[PDB]
Design a protein around this ligand. Structure first.
Ligand SMILES: CC(=O)NCc1cc(Oc2ccc(-n3c(=O)n(C4CCNCC4)c4ncnc(N)c43)cc2)c(O)cc1F
Ligand SMILES: Nc1ncnc2c1ncn2[C@@H]1O[C@H](COP(=O)(O)OC(=O)[C@@H](N)Cc2c[nH]c3ccccc23)[C@@H](O)[C@H]1O
Ligand SMILES: O=c1[nH]c2cc(Cl)ccc2o1
Lengths: 333, 323
């Protein structure tokens, strides 16, 4: 049987080129090599207050966007998190094997709390435990994520090991799969800040479903540096904006930064931004064309959701039963 | 009928205080209310404990509740973990609970110890519960559940019933060696308690050590301030036999505390022997217990699923596509 890949994305905000390069791109390329399972994590999304109509539409938007990226429901399992109760069941049980301090130290909880001081809720704090349940339910070997999720993956490993050490080989210990390019795409006007799918300043982001012409304008206005002469060279410390642009370009074209640096020898930021906008505009145009054929076919989205929840449930129920037997619950009839 | 939700913790043997002071009265209220008894194994694991003892204690608790008279045809009795909706609603309600609310209820406590008040709130709100017979140590938990229900309702409509404490109490069973303290199932000093499974020799021994007073002559008279131990023995005897405190005071005129203790032990063990016979009959019948759990979980999930669906609809989740 193939090793198992699991990963998820929130139906909140609007997925960006950052979400694509750090995660979805890898999701698509691993579908034959591994047994892949991809999740729309609507239970995680509501740790930030959502409008109910927005959340429903965004869940379906996200599903269609997975399909548009090339996630293939005949190859991978695609499902909505709340459709599989085992996620919440194992999440509760794993609370009891997770320490308070492991959660309080989390960068995401601290960043999100500062952004939403009016809604610092227990779900936001408990977020990593539910994520660990997401992963461990499927005997997951590889978890393809961006860099910002490293700390959460590491906790899920610590939980798997702690539980296994008491109870036996109940969980696989997952490993992160973080790309060499595009693991942390940066904001266009603030290249020291991760690109956000919920930025108040849209000029910082390249949304997957955004008008390509709007994206191309945003690329040209991306901040660079004062170097004289202007030089296309990778240096995150001193040339954050140029470096981020090179990263996006490498991640879309598959070309190395060394290659790109040589290609831009004797050129300046106009050539750099012209190729970035060309490559990204082409990607988004093709993506969006596939997207609408999937997004407006409710019967197909309904079918994918149904089959996917059924496949996931068969795996998740097996793991949960072993977990419940190990901790000592009377098994359900 | 109003819906009553009670959570029965697997670990810890029930005492005569638990039985005469509450369960016995709830047993005769099963036609007045729609009573739900949830054996809360998911709450139990906030404290690390041996797995096989937890399984046994889950079944022990079920058989004892049956033995005390909970009627699975009249009331709903089930194991918490058998109903996924509890964890499902718990997660959702996490997202409507302030971190500060849980902190106001360190780095090495597990997250379940910190988060179980939200699971409690989900346990109650799942069943459109009207009444909850909390202990005094759970009043803040109930009040959080009410706060969560009102917060959610104010956002989404009247999805949840706002639960109320069960106010009325009602027999007074105090610790045998410390009569100012109530008899508690969780007491480490097992000599303060009489468990429902204790044999007549154990009851005699614990009653004989029960603290009395130095009155001379010894006088069997009710006085909680000045004669707490003798008063506790009198309350226990009256709770078992139904005889009034004045009647017992007349019955023990000119008698010593050894006489009183002898009758207390005899009365307590008489009451316990009928309960113990039923306990062991139920406990050793695997199929009966399995049927009770299967039926109870089916009844509970049927109600819980209706609430969860409404909650999920209010939040905006895409509804599940069943096969
Ligand atoms: C007596 C009664 O029926 N009360 C109502 C009621 C009880 C329910 O069951 C539980 C079980 C355990 C707790 N609980 C709980 O009450 N505590 C402490 C015990 C000492 N005093 C402060 C509160 C807990 N500590 C750790 N883990 C827990 N799970 C704790 C809390 C609740 C329950 O799940 C729902 C419910 F409505
Ligand atoms: N600017 C960026 N550059 C590169 N990668 C980025 C950027 N911003 C985000 N990412 C990555 O996108 C994925 C989805 O992010 P979400 O916020 O939806 O989603 C998250 O951040 C997860 N908690 C969702 C989740 C829930 N359970 C899981 C289990 C396994 C893996 C993932 C999950 C992630 O891989 C994230 O690292
Ligand atoms: O990960 C988690 N935490 C949780 C807390 C409750 Cl109350 C229920 C399910 C959960 O899953």
């Amino acid at each position: 049987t193939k090793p198992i890949v699991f990963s998820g994305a929130q139906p909140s905000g609007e997925l960006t080129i950052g979400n694509y390069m750090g995660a979805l791109r890898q999701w698509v390329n691993m579908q034959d090599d591994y047994h892949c399972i991809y999740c729309i994590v609507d239970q995680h999304a509501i740790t930030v207050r959502q409008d109910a109509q927005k959340l429903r539409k965004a869940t379906l938007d996200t599903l269609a966007l997975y399909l548009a990226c090339g996630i293939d429901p005949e190859k991978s399992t695609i499902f909505v998190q709340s459709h599989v109760p085992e996620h919440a069941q194992l999440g509760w049980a794993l609370n009891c094997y997770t320490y308070f301090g492991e959660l309080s130290r989390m960068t995401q909880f601290k960043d999100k709390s500062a952004r939403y001081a009016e809604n610092i809720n227990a779900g936001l704090f408990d977020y990593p435990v539910l994520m660990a349940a997401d992963i461990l339910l499927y005997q997951t070997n590889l978890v393809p994520v961006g860099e910002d999720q490293k700390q959460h993956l590491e906790l899920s490993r610590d939980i798997a090991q702690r539980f296994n050490a008491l109870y036996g080989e109940i969980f696989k210990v997952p490993e992160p799969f973080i790309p060499k390019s595009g693991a942390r795409v940066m904001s266009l006007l603030e290249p020291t800040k991760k690109m956000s799918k919920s930025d108040d300043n849209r000029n910082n982001v390249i949304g997957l479903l955004e008008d390509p012409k709007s994206v191309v304008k945003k690329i040209k206005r991306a901040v660079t540096d004062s170097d004289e002469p202007p030089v296309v060279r990778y240096d995150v410390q001193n040339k954050a904006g140029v470096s981020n642009l090179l990263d996006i370009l490498s991640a879309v074209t598959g070309q190395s930064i060394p290659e790109l640096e040589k290609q831009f020898e004797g050129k300046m930021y106009g050539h750099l931004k012209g190729e970035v906008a060309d490559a990204v505009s082409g990607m988004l145009t093709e993506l969006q064309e596939r997207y609408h054929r999937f997004r407006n076919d409710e019967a197909f989205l309904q079918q994918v959701m149904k089959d996917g929840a059924e496949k996931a449930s068969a795996h998740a129920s097996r793991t949960l039963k072993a977990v419940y037997e190990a901790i000592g619950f009377v098994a359900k009839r």
